[PDB]
């Protein structure tokens, strides 16, 4: 298993357990501000989205 | 109808439609949103627009529109114009080329407890990513993202009436069949503002094309 | 609504939306402009028309709508219909269908220190001169000219909005997560430029547009 | 402005003019005189069976409330008012096929010391002209423009053709008026007859 | 007429056009609906829509708009703008283009006992499901569903609207002299339920 | 009537396949008239 | 801004938009009319229509909208909604199937002198005799006749702003080249009325078609 962070932007930190070997932090900007999404895996992102995939425990933030 | 004439005169003598209908400004207005799909009008695969006929049922409590039925002849349940009260500013976020918000201002049904039911109709032209690789045997998932345009989640809360869109009055289409449909509520938080959420309800419909026309006339 | 109603009466009892928010006539109203493109609907080549869906973020200041949170129980912001406040009549100049204004006149957000934010959405059919030489392998340069319809550059001034890092957003903003590409058209560049021009009479007031 | 504004105060505030009341007794009908001018024939769509016309409709009726003595108002002899201030017979094209019953531009009325009201609203009308295809492309078509009031009946208003004068003799105008100098013929349709009937 | 103006002022003193006429709580308003087809414009198969031009025939009773004619110089009928009186919120439910309303705002005829007759014109694009199996030798069954959008059965009650003939009609009325038949379509049956 | 043509005339293809071409032209003729729904097939399309 | 609000309050206290804005009813309103051509949208030859984008600049003086700037904080110009004031009723007489009059009621600029400048946009759909004799090498001459619909020359006088239409902001047309452009004022007298002229201003444009499209795709 592997522990990843899964909270949204600037929210209190929360964690979850998952079977993938990578955590991901995905950051993008819309008309209102900056959204940060945290989870497991290494998803495919649309162009223009900052993606940070890491392979160790609790490495999102 | 003189009791209801008295009541309608009383209710809108000091009424304000700009500010939210709450006792205290620290309370959010609780709105229940349900989508009824009457007819799938068109799926334009070139411009990527789904045209549907819908009814957008919205339910909420107006704190200042309550009355004692015993003071007005036992009247409990009235119909008033929607133009003169506060409403949610529900906008279709992914509107392609139609109307962003409700433009047909039908009547509000109002209880003596201040409960408001408002079911205006709309023609929703929604942008949908259309996959044409399997055409005419293609499967399309198209959505309607609805939200309060100028109210965040701390001042107005929108709740789904049901997890399914209402399809009980849905007219059967000659070109598409709806295999599944659902509605999901989403909370969005921004890095600058940890405290205020932004709520949306995205209804989606998975549709399968009936391929007989293109089988006979092309293949 | 016990404090929002108080604030509304405090602000809009003596207020004129027909007048600019300036203490002196010679002052200029500064307006931060951002344009978010939701969808690129089409480019009709026979009609030479670009159809787009946009959200126009407009930010400015109104000293007559100033208040403080502490004197109204903590009301940080107030949402009012856009007809009750003075607006800068931003219009798309190079429209082809005769439509200059926005599609939905949304509520304006009035914040504490007179700050006013307005995000109306619009459907715009604009003029695009289609250069035909390399059709169907062509690329096009389509323009969106935004300008105040009634005020000159000495009464209404345009600046671009800024991001969380303070960098000036001199482009069309696009929600990269929510964007669906047009089935025929790919957007390669979207620069934004503020232009200032000399007035219709030498020495008189100038004109500006984005 | 002085006598114009004085006359407007006299007619609409001193006399308390009511546009909802028709200018007649309860059992009397108002005589409305109608004439039509064809500015241009735009098209006759065959598949849609639709005639599109630019037509200026001339309406005349006497309103005894909107009368004055010219010598009491500086010899003023004509007044121009918005149509939303006076009583209108509300003449519409019954024969339309797109839902556009009403005239296009609600222009000013002209009122006179006798109480006569003149109104020349221009309009663009899409009407149903069924097509006879038997002799196509050598066919001729018979289209019509039917004008009536859906707000009033025969007991309230009376429709008639416009009366014009030549050499002191009156005649009803029984034709569509076409200005010969200004008219441009349609590219594929030539007009043979222009009658008018009540 | 001055007596007409005084009557109109008397009737509309304290009158609310947004309030249903119901003297007692629980009283229904009986609304009689008929329809006159002026022209069947089209049946577009590619859009599954029938375009018609019609005249509605709405009859009901407003108790508030009654008067004694002998106290008002014999006036027993009035022609009042429709926005000034309470209307039933009757709409074409199976519209295909998003339009629910009538084409033109006209007068409502009010009798001295409170009887209301409203005959607005309408252009309607209603929804028709085309059965394609025997095209172009086909026949089609196109419906126009009229209903009060807001009021339910406990408030507004509907009935089929009688023709100028005083009998229980079940039919769309067509004036046989002024109706030009569609060159593509022949009307076999035109009932009303 | 193509089967009544002699083989030595060398015109069987030039008749039958051009009849097919004309039928394609009439398919183009009806392409903008028939309903586009897929619940059933029009009998005229069955005949074509 | 308070001086401006007070000025607007006084200016429209005893104002009548129906009255022609002159001191004496026996003199005419002096109006200057200029036409600015932004874009030649289309020349439809079958129905003989020319659709154009224009700005219709109208200048006059309102007698009742004067003020001394020293009594109002030095303000000299204000912006006023056009629906609040008297306007000339300019109509395209040779309109084909578009709008007869101005429908977009923009704001006017008003000076302390009483000078009103109003520059609304319009889409002009004008009827034009089209000569197809030399097609695709044809030259067309299309006109826009403009006049006060209900006011005659004795009560409202209209003069052209310049001899020619303004083409300074004309977008290039890909199908036509405007070779000539001018504007002419016409006085029209009738036999029954020798004292009241009827005035019009006709702006004509001589256009030459670029024939490359029809050379390549037809000839
Ligand atoms: C395209 O299309 C278009 C169309 O759409 C076109 O256009 C066109 O063009 C043309 C050109 O080319 C044009 O023509 C022009 O016009 C103009 C205008 O007209 C108008 O007006 C006028 C004026 O009036 C006024 O006056 C008179 C007298 O004189 C009177 O009567 C009136 O009433 C008025 O009065 C008023 O005012 C004044 C001022 O102004 C004052 O003073 C007073 O008091 C008052 O207030 C007029 O006249 C006219 O009328 C006429 O016409 C009509 C129609 O139009 C008719 O209906 C009438 O009846 C008349 O007729 C008569 O005349 C004629 C001529 O005109 C003849 O033809 C006949 O037959 C008859 O007889 C109107 O209304 C005008 O003006 C011009 O004229 C000129 O020329 C002629 C020849 O052509 C001559 O005769 C004359 O005399 C003149 O001459 C002059 O000028 C010139 C230039 O322009 C020069 O060259 C010469 O030399 C001379 O000069 C002199 O004089 C001047 C003045 O004074 C001065 O300034 C200088 O310095 C010198 O001294 C013409 O005609 C037209 O119109 C148009 N149209 C429309 C727009 O529509 C185009 O072209 C096309 N394109 C292509 C094809 O490419
Ligand atoms: C897509 O279209 C755009 C136009 O909508 C193109 O942008 C333009 O590019 C041209 C050059 O190709 C620039 O023209 C230059 O302008 C400068 C500056 O102009 C000076 O004079 C004007 C008054 O006449 C004044 O207002 C200015 O402030 C300057 O003082 C000249 O020095 C050059 O000689 C030349 O004329 C346009 O200005 C520019 N428009 C802009 C930036 O708004 C764009 O290049 C196209 N994109 C492509 C094809 O990739
Ligand atoms: C609003 O009021 C506060 C308190 O007087 C002041 O400090 C601030 O500068 C004002 N803001 C504006 C826009 O004048
Ligand atoms: C109008 O003209 C007549 C002509 O006889 C004259 O007597 C009168 O004084 C003039 N003025 C007014 C105001 O009637």
Short mmCIF file of N, CA and C in Angstrom, two decimals, chain A residues 23-58:
data_model
loop_
_atom_site.label_atom_id
_atom_site.label_comp_id
_atom_site.label_asym_id
_atom_site.label_seq_id
_atom_site.Cartn_x
_atom_site.Cartn_y
_atom_site.Cartn_z
N UNK A 23 2.05 9.06 -5.82
CA UNK A 23 1.17 10.16 -5.45
C UNK A 23 1.28 11.23 -6.52
N UNK A 24 0.21 12.02 -6.67
CA UNK A 24 0.16 13.12 -7.63
C UNK A 24 -0.39 14.37 -6.96
N UNK A 25 0.22 15.50 -7.30
CA UNK A 25 -0.32 16.83 -7.06
C UNK A 25 -0.56 17.49 -8.42
N UNK A 26 -1.80 17.90 -8.66
CA UNK A 26 -2.21 18.50 -9.92
C UNK A 26 -2.68 19.92 -9.62
N UNK A 27 -2.04 20.90 -10.23
CA UNK A 27 -2.33 22.31 -10.01
C UNK A 27 -2.75 22.95 -11.32
N UNK A 28 -3.82 23.76 -11.27
CA UNK A 28 -4.18 24.57 -12.42
C UNK A 28 -4.84 25.85 -11.92
N UNK A 29 -5.08 26.77 -12.86
CA UNK A 29 -5.67 28.06 -12.56
C UNK A 29 -6.90 28.25 -13.44
N UNK A 30 -7.97 28.78 -12.85
CA UNK A 30 -9.16 29.21 -13.58
C UNK A 30 -9.35 30.70 -13.35
N UNK A 31 -10.49 31.22 -13.81
CA UNK A 31 -10.76 32.65 -13.71
C UNK A 31 -10.80 33.15 -12.28
N UNK A 32 -11.04 32.28 -11.30
CA UNK A 32 -11.21 32.69 -9.92
C UNK A 32 -9.92 32.59 -9.11
N UNK A 33 -9.13 31.54 -9.33
CA UNK A 33 -7.89 31.36 -8.60
C UNK A 33 -7.18 30.07 -8.95
N UNK A 34 -6.47 29.50 -7.98
CA UNK A 34 -5.63 28.32 -8.19
C UNK A 34 -6.27 27.14 -7.47
N UNK A 35 -6.46 26.04 -8.20
CA UNK A 35 -6.98 24.79 -7.65
C UNK A 35 -5.84 23.79 -7.60
N UNK A 36 -5.71 23.12 -6.46
CA UNK A 36 -4.74 22.05 -6.25
C UNK A 36 -5.53 20.81 -5.85
N UNK A 37 -5.28 19.70 -6.55
CA UNK A 37 -5.92 18.42 -6.29
C UNK A 37 -4.83 17.40 -6.00
N UNK A 38 -5.01 16.62 -4.94
CA UNK A 38 -4.02 15.65 -4.50
C UNK A 38 -4.64 14.25 -4.52
N UNK A 39 -3.84 13.26 -4.88
CA UNK A 39 -4.34 11.90 -4.88
C UNK A 39 -3.25 10.91 -5.21
N UNK A 40 -3.67 9.70 -5.57
CA UNK A 40 -2.76 8.62 -5.95
C UNK A 40 -2.80 8.40 -7.46
N UNK A 41 -1.77 7.73 -7.95
CA UNK A 41 -1.62 7.48 -9.37
C UNK A 41 -0.76 8.54 -10.03
N UNK A 42 -0.68 8.44 -11.35
CA UNK A 42 -0.09 9.48 -12.19
C UNK A 42 -1.04 9.69 -13.36
N UNK A 43 -2.10 10.47 -13.17
CA UNK A 43 -3.11 10.59 -14.23
C UNK A 43 -2.58 11.37 -15.41
N UNK A 44 -3.26 11.20 -16.54
CA UNK A 44 -2.98 11.98 -17.74
C UNK A 44 -3.73 13.29 -17.63
N UNK A 45 -3.00 14.39 -17.77
CA UNK A 45 -3.55 15.73 -17.62
C UNK A 45 -3.71 16.36 -18.99
N UNK A 46 -4.67 17.26 -19.10
CA UNK A 46 -4.78 18.08 -20.28
C UNK A 46 -3.58 19.03 -20.33
N UNK A 47 -3.24 19.57 -21.51
CA UNK A 47 -2.13 20.53 -21.57
C UNK A 47 -2.40 21.76 -20.72
N UNK A 48 -1.34 22.33 -20.16
CA UNK A 48 -1.44 23.52 -19.34
C UNK A 48 -1.70 23.30 -17.88
N UNK A 49 -1.64 22.05 -17.41
CA UNK A 49 -1.89 21.70 -16.02
C UNK A 49 -0.58 21.21 -15.42
N UNK A 50 -0.14 21.84 -14.33
CA UNK A 50 1.09 21.41 -13.67
C UNK A 50 0.79 20.09 -12.97
N UNK A 51 1.61 19.08 -13.26
CA UNK A 51 1.50 17.76 -12.65
C UNK A 51 2.82 17.42 -11.98
N UNK A 52 2.75 16.97 -10.73
CA UNK A 52 3.93 16.53 -9.98
C UNK A 52 3.63 15.15 -9.43
N UNK A 53 4.25 14.13 -10.02
CA UNK A 53 4.13 12.75 -9.57
C UNK A 53 5.38 12.40 -8.78
N UNK A 54 5.18 11.79 -7.61
CA UNK A 54 6.29 11.36 -6.76
C UNK A 54 6.03 9.95 -6.26
N UNK A 55 7.12 9.27 -5.88
CA UNK A 55 7.10 7.83 -5.64
C UNK A 55 7.24 7.44 -4.17
N UNK A 56 7.31 8.39 -3.24
CA UNK A 56 7.48 8.10 -1.82
C UNK A 56 6.24 8.53 -1.04
N UNK A 57 6.27 8.26 0.27
CA UNK A 57 5.10 8.42 1.12
C UNK A 57 4.86 9.88 1.47
N UNK A 58 3.60 10.32 1.34
CA UNK A 58 3.17 11.66 1.77
C UNK A 58 4.00 12.76 1.09
#
